[PDB]
């Protein structure tokens, strides 16, 4: 049975944005409940393109899925942040939620071609799709008002503001709060920029202004934490509404009556609920078990406050919507990539509905085992241990750590950068680390910004993270599973920070890979520009200290270059590389084994399939080289190993 290689992993299809959870709106049920519509994305590293398909599948399971549209460009998820109308893209794709017409015969949805987001309309038995709305601005959302009428939104003001920036540039721009140098040398558009609503009649091609009523049908979103059954409104609240770390509890109000709080433990920290008038019940989801490692679904007769658990598992259920007494969900788990599933709301039985991948038991899969421990600060931790398919007990393996969430399918860790199953296939033990809760998250805080400030104070939470990794390593060391002198560490985003912290404040790692650098004043103050730099200070990032200040000594590679002896590979997007340069240069000057790779037209999370594959392969090669002393003799890698042999020789 063939192995799971980087070539296999990069081609495993997906549904919705990279990191999806309970409320990710990645599917839509038809009005009568008989069909589910959703987008499938599949990456091709040879053509270096994602291929997108809009898919319709009967919820009864009896007929094959149908592609009702094929095509489009990778549409970035973007939002306003920091007072900018559009922050740099994280690189993640926007989840595309198809809108069914009231008749159930057509879909409307966003789709990008030639750099422009339009509304497309597709026939649901497969007969074709075409764009029906385009404007000077990207369309941001759409709904059906009736079978022939669409309302849609976007920001022509954003376009106009861009043209004003372009005019102003003729006189030079003052460097101020509009700039974010890391990502580009132009002023950004500042908020406020308004959203404009328009209505299109598809039968006449005419457009008109929306009415306030129509507008609210687009603007208002359902609260997934609120439901009605009869006269009873279910919601969730805290005994102390200000304290964000106080657990929420299910509450019931009959009409305008007093709220009644459910006392049961099961009613705490609900993530999703659904009311069913016919059955007169409330259903809800939540996380539970050690370190919240499992999901569970509850059924609660709406007369009372006695929830009963009907399903629980490791994994995730995402985007779930109800048809009668089934839930239709996306679902994933360690060895199951994202697929659609039906959950029986009486028995709690889960059945396959649609899997865009073949069955992976076709491949020789690594062995997975969920680890649990309480860390030295008393906090419950889980993580996943992945072992090579031919693992014989007694064998001490090199270890590679991938961060920092492990709830779902073991793909590439956060940002999909570090290939878990292929690493195991290559002979490594892999720890898929699920970063634990901070101490601060157990204390009273009125703002997530104030909590952050407590976590960064003296890098207290970063130490809790590092000590947790050291606990896990020590565990696997006692079990005789790993050689503790041969531990590799990877990170992207918050995991990158952990890598930087880890290489300076321990000697437990023999090799590392990061997607970005650095955690230093240059990156956080200078390259962010004055707006973001100033805003980060409230989060506990000391951007008013220069790099030789006390806060940065724990993480700056410029300050600590001369004692940083661990081999480090940085595989950066061009959009983040500038931040790495002072650090990189100090390391080279101090003759350390560091290498920086740059990828063009990329983001914080990488989107181009050829790039991802190349990242996967180099990261495997890197760990094989430093932790196994092995090199692949393929002649197109010879120059890479020349370079890495030279890095190795610097160490003496």
């Amino acid at each position: 049975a063939p192995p799971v290689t980087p070539e296999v992993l990069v081609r495993l299809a997906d549904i919705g944005t990279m990191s999806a959870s309970e409320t990710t709106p990645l599917l839509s049920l038809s009005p009568d409940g008989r069909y589910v519509a959703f987008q499938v994305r599949q990456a091709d590293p040879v053509t270096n393109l994602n291929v997108f398909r809009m898919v319709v599948k009967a919820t009864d399971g009896a007929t094959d899925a149908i592609d009702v549209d094929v095509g489009g460009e990778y549409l970035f998820w973007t939002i306003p942040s920091w007072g900018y109308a559009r922050n740099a893209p994280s690189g993640a794709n926007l989840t595309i939620q198809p809108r069914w017409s009231p008749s159930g015969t057509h879909l409307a949805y966003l789709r990008q071609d030639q750099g422009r987001v339009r509304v497309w309309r597709a026939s649901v038995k497969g007969e074709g799709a075409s764009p029906v709305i385009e404007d000077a601005y990207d369309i941001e959302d759409v709904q059906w008002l009736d079978d022939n009428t669409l309302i849609y939104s976007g920001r022509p003001g954003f376009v106009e503001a861009e043209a004003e920036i372009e005019r102003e540039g003729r006189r030079g721009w003052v460097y101020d709060e509009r700039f974010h140098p890391l990502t580009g040398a132009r002023p950004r558009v500042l908020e406020p920029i308004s959203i404009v609503y328009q209505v299109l009649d598809l039968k006449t091609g005419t457009r008109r202004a929306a009415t306030p009523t129509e507008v609210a049908r687009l603007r208002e979103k359902p609260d997934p934490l609120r439901a009605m059954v009869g006269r009873t409104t279910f919601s969730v609240s805290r005994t102390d509404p200000q304290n964000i770390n106080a657990p929420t509890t299910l509450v019931a109000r009959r009409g305008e009556g007093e709220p009644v709080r459910c006392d049961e433990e099961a009613c705490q920290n609900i993530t999703r609920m659904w009311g069913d008038e016919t059955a007169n019940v409330l259903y809800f989801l939540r996380r539970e078990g050690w370190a919240s490692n499992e999901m569970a679904l509850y059924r609660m007769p709406a007369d009372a406050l006695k929830p009963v658990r009907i399903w629980h598992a490791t994994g995730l259920l995402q985007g779930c919507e109800r048809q009668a007494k089934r839930l239709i969900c996306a679902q994933e788990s360690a060895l199951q990539p994202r697929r659609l599933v039906t959950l029986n709301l009486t028995s709690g039985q889960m059945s396959p509905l649609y899997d865009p991948n073949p069955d992976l038991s076709r491949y020789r899969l690594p062995k997975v085992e969920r680890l649990t421990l309480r860390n030295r600060n008393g906090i419950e931790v889980f993580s996943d241990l992945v072992l090579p398919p031919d693992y014989q007990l007694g064998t001490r393996l090199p270890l590679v750590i991938v961060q920092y969430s492990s709830r779902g399918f073991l793909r590439g860790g956060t940002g999909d950068e570090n290939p878990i199953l292929p690493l195991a296939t290559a002979g490594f033990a892999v720890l898929s680390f699920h970063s634990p809760r901070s101490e601060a998250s157990y204390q009273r805080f009125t703002s997530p910004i104030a909590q952050s400030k407590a976590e960064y104070s003296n890098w207290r939470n970063r130490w809790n993270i590092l000590h947790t990794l050291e606990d896990l390593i020590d565990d696997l060391d006692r079990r005789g599973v790993i050689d503790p002198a041969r531990v590799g560490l990877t990170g992207l985003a918050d995991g990158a920070t952990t890598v930087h912290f880890g290489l300076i404040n321990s000697h437990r790692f023999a090799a590392a890979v990061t997607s970005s650098c650095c955690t230093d004043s240059f990156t956080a103050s200078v390259m962010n520009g004055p707006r973001i730099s100033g805003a980060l200070k409230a989060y506990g990032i000391e951007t008013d200290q220069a790099d030789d200040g006390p806060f940065w000594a724990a993480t700056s590679f410029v300050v600590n270059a001369s004692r940083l002896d661990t081999p480090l590979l940085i595989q950066s997007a061009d959009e983040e590389y500038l931040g790495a340069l002072p650090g990189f240069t100090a390391l080279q000057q101090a003759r350390k084994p560091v290498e920086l790779i740059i990828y063009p037209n990329e983001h914080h999370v990488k989107w181009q399939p050829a790039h991802r594959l190349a990242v996967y392969n180099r990261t495997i090669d890197w760990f094989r080289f430093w932790l196994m002393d092995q090199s692949d003799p393929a002649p197109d890698k010879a120059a890479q190993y020349d370079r890495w042999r030279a890095l190795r020789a610097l160490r003496q």
Partner: peptide, 17 residues
């Protein structure tokens, strides 16, 4: 991180959760 909600994804202006 990929998902732009609550907390810091590193120190360069991206959000987590």
């Amino acid at each position: 991180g990929p998902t732009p909600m609550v907390g810091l994804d590193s120190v360069s202006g991206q959000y987590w959760d």
